[PDB]
Design a protein around this nucleic acid. Structure first.
Ligand SMILES: CON(C)Cc1ccc(O)c2c1C[C@H]1C[C@H]3[C@H](N(C)C)C(O)=C(C(N)=O)C(=O)[C@@]3(O)C(O)=C1C2=O
Ligand SMILES: [Mg+2]
Ligand SMILES: [Mg+2]
Ligand SMILES: [Mg+2]
Ligand SMILES: [Mg+2]
Ligand SMILES: [Mg+2]
Ligand SMILES: [Mg+2]
Ligand SMILES: [Mg+2]
Ligand SMILES: [Mg+2]
Ligand SMILES: [Mg+2]
Ligand SMILES: [Mg+2]
Ligand SMILES: [Mg+2]
Ligand SMILES: [Mg+2]
Ligand SMILES: [Zn+2]
Lengths: 134, 64, 214, 122, 60, 98, 84, 155
RNA sequence: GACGGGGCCCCGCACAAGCGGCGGAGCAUGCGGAUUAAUUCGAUGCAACGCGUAGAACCUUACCUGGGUUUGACAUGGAUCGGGAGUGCUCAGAGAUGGGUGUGCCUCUUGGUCGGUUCACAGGUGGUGCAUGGCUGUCGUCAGCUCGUGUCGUGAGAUGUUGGGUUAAGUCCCGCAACGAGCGCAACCCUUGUUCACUGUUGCCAGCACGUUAUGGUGGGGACUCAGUGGAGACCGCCGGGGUCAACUCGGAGGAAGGUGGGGAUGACGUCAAGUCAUCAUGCCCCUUAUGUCCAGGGCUUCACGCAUGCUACAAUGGCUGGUACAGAGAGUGGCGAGCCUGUGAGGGUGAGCGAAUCUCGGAAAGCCGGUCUCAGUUCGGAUUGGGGUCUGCAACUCGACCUCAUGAAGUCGGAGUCGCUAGUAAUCGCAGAUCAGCAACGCUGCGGUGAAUACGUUCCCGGGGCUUGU
């Protein structure tokens, strides 16, 4: 019921071979990922929502700054890792007022979905060569 | 030795399976004392000596 | 036809490599000399009975552990045969060989020597069923938890090939923590050769290198 | 009859109307435009005769084009035929000359598949 | 492989480009690894038997 | 100061050798940086399992090289002699950069 | 084709034979297995029996041969057609 | 499958228009795995929709989907020595899927140049009540009515 | 036992529901056929056909023409004459080889090394995979296959292993003339998902001090990330319902992860006289101035055709062009090569650095953004063909890759039929490695990027499992 707490904090996020070092701090709510701003590093609204929505589902809103260092993976994987990092930071800052909703939204969870390895005799992880009877 | 025995007959029986046939050996033995007690034993095995021994030990307990 | 080598399957997990050296620019030539050493030793020391040849290297110096059932043949008289085989080893390789020969505590339990003996009997034309039963009985008298022997070929000098086998106890080939010793030999008969394979379940081993080699 | 022996198609950019000429490709047309100092992004129907003939003069002076290059290529092939090289023999046979495989397809030289009757199994 | 072929491969090949590898245990001319000599079959069997240090089955 | 590179194929013997080196140098004073693990070299070989005409079933092997690094901060010529004279297992090599 | 800065490749015995033929009269057939060699002006007007795998087929080298290899004029495969 | 009904992946909502319908539309366009290209197409089509009519593009997409939604469709049946076309009622999820698939396919089949406003034109026509998608819906309903006599074979 | 166009009960991308293909076109590649002096040999329904080949210009090479050789190209052992062997430069030759010329053992009075003459003998990718070993495919990750003892039956044989319930599972539970055990299932192993301790360079940079402006470049730091060792963690363990019960099953909480979490390794008894005498090994047979062996050239690359696996396409969800983001896994000293100069470019010339968490390969591409093309057999497609080149190599004619200039073929989404896939999958996007001087690699094995639709269901098609019935 309480509007959570502002408080600085930090965490790490990972998703699909991408690492996200997140440091959330009280502020105006601006972003800086690898130096460049959000609208530069995530140039399109395709997957800005996935990283912004941890705040939306938390009590705090876009009046709380964050600094992100992002490595590995592609754009979407980096987005997911950053989202998980922000969720974990909010978690360990306020594990009572934001923990229930934040976990219920399925956000304090790291999906282990990773590219399955290729297998001998198969064109891809599961694709098989075209069977030709006689 | 102590008890005199004869191997009456041996036969090669088989059981047909998906792979093929599972052969086996049957043994008739007659074991007696030579003085009035005698018995007959039937033995099943995968091998002739094992079938014979099983038949002999089964005949020991059938002495009349 | 479709079964993995037990030693290769358990390699690194429970059993260990027979060669212990590191080299990254000569690797192939050291492998070649190792092959030469092993082939020479196997071809010239059948009589002793070779469980394993273990090769180590420190710096241009090779060390050979020869695990043999009866090292009497290897040592000859007062080490004369040992000296001659060492000298042949320098002749073959060109490096300083330090050769030591070790016993096998239970040759009737080591699978490789068991295959050695079974193949020797088959070559000497002993009934294969009797030979397999003797080896099995001796292994369980020694105290192995499981024996499995398989002789494949023109058994008894016949025309068709058979794959006759014996086993009792437990031989869990699929279990990695299971310590399974595997041996193989070929009986050279007047009718080709017979392949004799032996699995012996020594027991169950844990980790840390099988308790760091127990 | 706009250029040497070909009519540039109207309503199409000059940089590709030039490539419509035999003996002129993309880079050849681009050079030609840079040498003549003529834009390449204007349609052909706005082309003054002075710049048109300047382009024609540059092309004629620098480049073998149209009938000249076609005759030269035919002469080269005929010379291969008459000298009797391996390539010439393949040319006469109407079969690939540059070491292409001929077991399976070679289709662009062998034409359409003229399937033939073969031996019949029992 | 043939013994003559094995010895010919072992000897210097006049021209440098004419050299080839051969399985140093087996004589096989196809699928010979530079890292450790040998060949496909020789590698498989020797790795199983454990004479190749560091080489173990991979199941990542 | 004074680099020691350890390379082998078994991380147990790597760790044992590194522990022996660090405990030796320390027994001779010389405080030394802890054994830092370098990334392991990972070579992969794929082999047709069958000797003939069976390519879809294959076997994969790896040769993993484990590397550790030691720094001998204290010069300590006595430790220099100790590190040149001690004995190490055959499977692991040593590289001393003075 | 061969690099220009390496020059044409003439098999260094065909060259010596054609030079000897030039010195002692350009009238003989020069038998060679050097399909590998490059035709040069110095041999123009000669006749060279180039091996084709089973026979030394003779070619009379003319002016236009020069930019070609000796083996281009000695076909190795015979086809004649499928069927008849 | 034999084991049972496999779980369904939850459908996400479009960040821009806040409707799962547009996300389903982009995931249905979604050729070659290019999500960004697909939703650029979809957003362009929706903006063209709101350009040509003042009403909301998500509402016009919804109206088109209701106009293309089939109520019942026939499936092949192997009763006897001849095949039957048994009409079966269509669940809401299945009919939304069918409407979206038909919309996308007929948009791809339209004659205009670019996919974005081929889809825009098809959406507007369907919302009005015209187009190939609506025609196919009517034809499937007509054939279901023709084969309505086999409504008793449902299991 | 097997089979059934017999039943009941089941399972698998087996259908269905979907998405993308193949079959049409061009090319790449394998094969059949034909051809040839030779087109070396093996593979032939699934389970042969981008398969042995993880690299055929010479070599490889096993084939063909021709030229050489005969204890032989190579081993091992006795004798016997020896001191050089072995080689540098030259000559003849297509080369093999032959002839010159230079150089010519270390011990020791009897060895290492070679020579012949022999003598033994070697050699064979010559035959037979139905003489074999080894290794492998395969049914089949299928849930099974058996044994000891007891018992039933004259006997083969049966029981266990049937039945009810359950499970991914002969997985367990209940009952039971069965009581037990073994190989399979599962687990132990590797990898991935969470976390802790330890260590801190070549990795990392939160707080501290400068740095040429600049680069964690610097002192330094154990925080974060990562590297790699050792631990923790998941067990239907907890809660509730169902299930007499009991196994199980449903729901929930906690949690990174919940009911096997994902993937790999692992392939029971056996089947197919399945593949391999050509990797190796080997029984027997065959060759021995030739079926051995050396060499040059040729062939394995042929082309009226047929099949198969792929690649590029047929365009606008696209082509072209400028700018601009985000990887992982790997390789490297005859190697990876930066930087600079030169050339349109392939490249060349110089040339640091790095045996490599350091240096190099390096650029990721798709994507985003701006411009442009405007549905045109095209600014689609890039086959073919003509010219000029580069590099590797003794040598690119047959028969290499690449660059550049020109040329601009079929192809408008493909007949009957057919294939793959249930989630980080399909679809697509690039990257790396093995072999390898170079490369016909679009193949193979991996790596990450983007990232779906659908599964009502078992009626039907294919394969299989338990029991039962008929023969
Ligand atoms: C011919 O000699 N007599 C008459 C008998 C025979 C004798 C010795 C043999 O060594 C083989 C054969 C029969 C063939 C048949 C082969 C055939 N295959 C080549 C297509 C086949 O149809 C299958 C198959 N589809 O399963 C096989 O079984 C097969 O491959 C095989 O094993 C064979 C042999 O090797
Ligand atoms: Mg080569
Ligand atoms: Mg279907
Ligand atoms: Mg086609
Ligand atoms: Mg062939
Ligand atoms: Mg053969
Ligand atoms: Mg056969
Ligand atoms: Mg066979
Ligand atoms: Mg055959
Ligand atoms: Mg298992
Ligand atoms: Mg042979
Ligand atoms: Mg071929
Ligand atoms: Mg599945
Ligand atoms: Zn080999």
């Amino acid at each position: 019921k309480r509007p959570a707490m502002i408080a600085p904090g930090a965490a790490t996020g990972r998703r699909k071979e991408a690492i996200a070092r997140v440091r959330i701090t009280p502020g105006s709510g601006q972003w800086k990922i690898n130096g460049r701003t959000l609208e530069d590093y995530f140039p399109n609204k395709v997957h800005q929502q996935i990283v912004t929505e941890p705040f939306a589902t938390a009590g705090v809103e876009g009046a709380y700054d964050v600094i992100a260092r992002i490595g590995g993976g592609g754009v979407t994987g980096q987005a997911g890792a950053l989202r998980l990092g922000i969720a974990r930071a909010l978690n360990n800052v306020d594990p009572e007022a934001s923990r229930p909703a934040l976990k219920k939204a399925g956000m304090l969870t790291r999906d282990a979905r990773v590219k399955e390895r290729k297998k001998a005799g198969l064109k891809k992880a599961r694709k098989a060569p075209q069977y030709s009877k006689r | 030795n102590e008890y005199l025995e004869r191997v009456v007959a041996i036969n090669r029986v088989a059981k047909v399976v998906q792979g093929g046939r599972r052969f086996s050996f049957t043994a008739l033995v007659v074991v007696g004392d030579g003085e009035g007690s005698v018995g007959v034993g039937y033995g099943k095995a995968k091998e002739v000596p094992a079938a014979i021994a099983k038949a002999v030990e089964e005949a020991k307990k059938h002495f009349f | 036809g479709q079964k993995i080598n037990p030693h290769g399957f358990r390699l690194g997990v429970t059993t260990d490599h027979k060669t212990r050296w590191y080299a990254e620019k000569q690797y192939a030539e050291l492998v070649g000399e190792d092959v030469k050493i092993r082939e020479w030793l196997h071809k010239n020391l059948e009589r002793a009975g070779l469980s394993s040849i273990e090769i180590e290297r420190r710096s241009e110096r090779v060390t050979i552990f020869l695990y043999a059932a009866r090292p009497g043949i290897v040592i000859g008289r007062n080490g004369a045969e040992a000296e001659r085989v060492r000298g042949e080893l320098e002749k073959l390789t060109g490096k300083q060989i330090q050769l030591n020969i070790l016993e096998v505590k239970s040759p009737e339990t080591d699978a490789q020597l068991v295959a050695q003996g079974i193949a020797e009997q088959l070559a000497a034309r002993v009934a294969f069923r009797r030979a397999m039963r003797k080896a099995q009985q001796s292994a369980m008298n020694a105290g192995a938890l499981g024996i499995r022997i398989k002789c494949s070929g023109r058994l008894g000098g016949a025309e068709m090939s058979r794959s006759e086998g014996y086993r009792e106890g437990r031989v869990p080939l699929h279990t990695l923590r299971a310590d399974i010793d595997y041996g193989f030999f070929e009986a050279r008969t007047t009718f080709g050769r017979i392949g004799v394979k032996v699995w012996i379940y020594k027991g169950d081993v844990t980790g840390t290198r099988a308790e760091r080699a127990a | 009859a706009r250029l040497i022996g070909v009519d540039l198609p109207r309503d199409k950019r000059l940089e590709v109307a030039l490539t419509y000429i035999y003996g002129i490709g993309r880079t050849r047309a681009t050079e030609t435009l840079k040498a003549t100092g003529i834009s390449g992004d204007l349609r052909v129907h706005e082309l003054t005769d002075d710049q048109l003939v300047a382009l024609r003069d540059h092309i004629e002076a620098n480049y073998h084009v149209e009938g000249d290059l076609r005759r030269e290529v035919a002469a080269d092939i005929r010379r291969k035929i008459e000298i009797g090289t391996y390539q010439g023999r393949r040319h006469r046979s109407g079969l690939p000359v540059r070491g292409q495989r001929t077991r399976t397809n070679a289709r662009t030289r062998k034409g359409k598949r003229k399937a033939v009757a073969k031996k019949k199994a029992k | 492989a043939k013994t003559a072929l094995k010895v010919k491969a072992a000897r210097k090949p006049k021209f440098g480009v004419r050299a080839y590898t051969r399985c140093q245990r087996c004589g096989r001319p196809h699928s010979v690894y530079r890292k450790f000599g040998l060949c496909r079959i020789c590698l498989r069997e020797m790795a199983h038997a454990g004479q190749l240090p560091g080489v173990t089955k991979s199941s990542w | 100061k004074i680099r020691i590179r350890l390379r082998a194929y078994d991380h147990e013997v790597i760790d044992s050798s590194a522990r022996k080196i660090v405990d030796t140098v320390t027994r001779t004073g010389a405080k030394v940086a802890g054994p830092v693990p370098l990334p392991t070299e990972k070579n992969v070989f794929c082999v047709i399992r069958s000797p003939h005409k069976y390519k879809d079933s294959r076997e994969h092997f790896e040769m993993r090289t484990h590397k550790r690094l030691i720094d001998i901060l204290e010069p300590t010529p006595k430790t220099v002699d100790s590190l040149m004279r001690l004995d190490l297992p055959a499977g692991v090599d040593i590289e001393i950069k003075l | 084709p061969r690099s220009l800065k390496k020059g044409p490749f003439v098999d260094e015995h065909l060259a010596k034979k054609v030079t000897a033929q030039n010195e002692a009269g350009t009238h003989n057939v020069i038998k060679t297995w050097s399909r590998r060699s490059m035709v040069t002006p110095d041999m123009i007007g000669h006749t060279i029996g180039v091996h084709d795998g089973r026979k030394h087929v003779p070619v009379f080298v003319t002016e236009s041969m020069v930019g070609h290899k000796l083996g281009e004029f000695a076909p190795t495969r015979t086809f004649k057609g499928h069927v008849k | 499958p034999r084991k049972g009904p496999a779980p369904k992946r939850p459908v996400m909502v479009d960040p821009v228009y806040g409707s799962p319908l547009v996300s389903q539309l982009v995931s249905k366009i979604l050729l070659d795995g290019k999500k960004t290209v697909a939703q650029n197409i979809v957003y362009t089509a929706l903006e063209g929709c709101r350009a040509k009519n003042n009403t909301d593009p998500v509402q016009t997409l919804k109206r088109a989907l209701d106009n293309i939604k089939p109520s019942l469709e026939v499936k092949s049946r192997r009763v006897g020595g001849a095949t039957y076309q048994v009409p079966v009622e269509v669940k809401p999820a299945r009919q939304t899927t069918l409407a979206m698939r038909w919309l996308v396919n007929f948009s791809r089949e339209r004659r205009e140049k670019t996919m974005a406003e081929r889809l825009m034109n098809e959406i507007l026509d369907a919302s009005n009540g015209l187009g190939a998608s609506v025609k196919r819906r009517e034809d499937t309903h007509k054939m279901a009515e023709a084969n309505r006599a086999f409504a008793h074979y449902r299991w």
